[PDB]
Design a protein around this ligand. Structure first.
Ligand SMILES: [Fe+2]
Ligand SMILES: [Fe+2]
Ligand SMILES: [Fe+2]
Ligand SMILES: [Fe+2]
Ligand SMILES: [Fe+2]
Ligand SMILES: [Fe+2]
Lengths: 170, 170
């Protein structure tokens, strides 16, 4: 595990950089697919995977990956920070500055992170005891990220999207 | 597009936070699968997709998504930044501080970003004239992110992993 202060900071910066490169490449892969460049999309998805490999390498070099219950706990703490501190403040500041699009994107994320924190707390209770959670499918709204387990609601309560738009993970 | 300075900054910070949560969750999904919790793995994967949605929303609200040629150009500049500036410095610093694990993860990423920059330059040439690239598959090394289009060397030139371990995008 890396211990020296400057190298640790540089790897955390590189982790952030690789995560953001991965994410832009996923966003760009979807746009290329929509514009009629399916091979360009394939290249973006593939390079996105390479940047996952690089960020995973940095993250393990920093000592941050543990067993499932501990990884769930990191999930819980991050989701809790975004629900209680980060997104309420960023949403209030956007409203204060009149930036309606940011009001919306921060509202969307906040309502979903409330769900994520609760799901990871239910998961951790099972993983603590060596059990897997019993969920069969998870549905995700592709507009706002709203997350539902086992059945999709009739429409998304956060953005109003129809049940038919939800993405299924089975 | 968001224009006020503080809101823009908070959206950039939220984009970084959602990217890193997505990346953590993909890393955690793989560890859950290895430890024998496939339903917790499925949960991490679906919630990572929700964070893709939230990041993509902030990224569009900042006005950073364009057409494929402009997105490739953002690719080129980021990859060129990592090759000529960021990784050489972080790698030399890790070496100076004796942090061999960081020397290795920065070396792995650096050699692959060299290839990414060149692939995106080749892709943009075609995109900016309305044509798709012609590629069949892309191979990615799961140890260091080495990337090869159409034909792969029999062993990864950076870490030595055999071609059978490469992840194939087709
Ligand atoms: Fe990378
Ligand atoms: Fe979340
Ligand atoms: Fe929604
Ligand atoms: Fe999120
Ligand atoms: Fe790269
Ligand atoms: Fe490799």
């Amino acid at each position: 595990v890396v211990k020296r202060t400057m190298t640790k900071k540089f790897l955390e910066e590189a982790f952030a950089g690789e995560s953001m490169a991965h994410m832009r490449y996923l966003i760009f892969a979807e746009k290329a697919e929509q514009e009629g460049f399916p091979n360009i999309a394939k290249l973006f998805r593939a390079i996105a995977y390479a940047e996952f490999v690089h960020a995973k390498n940095h993250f393990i070099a920093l000592g941050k990956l543990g067993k499932t219950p501990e990884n769930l706990q990191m999930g819980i703490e991050g989701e809790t920070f975004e629900v209680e501190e980060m997104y309420p403040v960023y949403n209030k500041a956007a409203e204060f500055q009149g930036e309606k699009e940011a009001v919306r994107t921060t509202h969307y994320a906040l309502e979903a992170e409330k769900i994520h924190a609760e799901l990871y707390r239910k998961a951790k209770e099972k993983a603590e005891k060596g059990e897997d959670i019993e969920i069969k499918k998870v549905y995700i709204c592709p507009i706002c990220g709203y997350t539902a387990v086992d059945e999709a609601p009739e429409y998304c309560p956060v953005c109003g999207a129809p049940k038919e738009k939800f993405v299924v993970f089975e």
